Amino acid sequence: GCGLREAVDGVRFIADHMRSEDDDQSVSEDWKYVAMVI
Amino acid sequence: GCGLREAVDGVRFIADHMRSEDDDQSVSEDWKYVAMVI
Amino acid sequence: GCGLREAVDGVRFIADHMRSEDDDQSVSEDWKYVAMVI
Amino acid sequence: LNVHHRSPRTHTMPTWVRRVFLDIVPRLLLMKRPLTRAVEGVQYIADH
Amino acid sequence: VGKYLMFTMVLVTFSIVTSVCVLNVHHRSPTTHTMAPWVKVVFLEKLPALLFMQ
Numbered sequence: 001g002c003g004l005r006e007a008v009d010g011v012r013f014i015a016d017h018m019r020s021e022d023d024d025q026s027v028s029e030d031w032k033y034v035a036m037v038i
Numbered sequence: 039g040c041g042l043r044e045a046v047d048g049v050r051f052i053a054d055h056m057r058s059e060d061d062d063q064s065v066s067e068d069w070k071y072v073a074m075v076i
Numbered sequence: 077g078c079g080l081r082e083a084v085d086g087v088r089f090i091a092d093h094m095r096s097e098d099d100d101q102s103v104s105e106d107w108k109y110v111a112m113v114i
Numbered sequence: 115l116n117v118h119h120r121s122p123r124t125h126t127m128p129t130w131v132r133r134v135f136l137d138i139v140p141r142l143l144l145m146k147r148p149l150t151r152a153v154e155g156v157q158y159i160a161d162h
Numbered sequence: 163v164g165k166y167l168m169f170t171m172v173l174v175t176f177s178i179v180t181s182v183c184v185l186n187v188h189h190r191s192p193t194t195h196t197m198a199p200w201v202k203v204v205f206l207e208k209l210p211a212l213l214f215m216q
């Protein structure tokens with residue numbers, strides 16, 4: 001019941017956190033590449 | 039039977055732990071922004 | 077159906093990945109201790 | 115130092131580099147190498 | 163020889179300034195900076211190709 005809904009919500013939050021982390025890492029790596037080009 | 043409950047508890051704990059890490063990272067980044075403003 | 081098998085496979089892969097990471101980190105700490113002793 | 119800080123996000127390793135510097139030169143130097151949402155989240159985590 | 167040394171010191175001072183700027187650019191993240199679209203179109207598409215960086 002409530003346990004299943006909590007587990008699903010937690011899994012979803014973990015997924016969203018990981019996607020946000022990937023996005024931030026990608027932007028940081030873009031900045032690194034810009035510095036390398038300069 | 040108890041295994042499903044243990045797994046639900048573990049998932050909740052993992053989600054809470056990553057929430058805490060996110061909050062700490064946010065505060066650290068705020069301090070970095072303060073230094074850059076100065 | 078296939079969703080459950082994929083979920084179990086992914087969970088097992090995550091557990092294996094963390095186990096390997098822990099083993100690597102432990103060996104690194106052993107090397108750091110050797111340097112400290114010297 | 116430039117070679118050491120290289121990553122797939124910025125460089126590609128040529129095959130000849132890989133072959134030479136991971137097979138021959140190391141050996142010549144006597145140094146030897148050692149619900150739908152939940153399952154979707156789990157798959158994304160594994161792939162990541 | 164002194165003229166050469168002067169010229170090279172001017173160049174090296176310029177390089178120090180440029181290295182400060184390059185380091186500043188390198189340590190940028192979304193939490194503190196936003197990349198302008200022109201920065202993208204220039205520095206990730208056009209100039210890299212001119213320099214054979216690929």
Ligand SMILES: CCCCCCCC
Nearest residue numbers: 011014052087090159
């Ligand atoms: C089942 C959720 C696993 C999350 C692992 C995150 C490691 C940084």
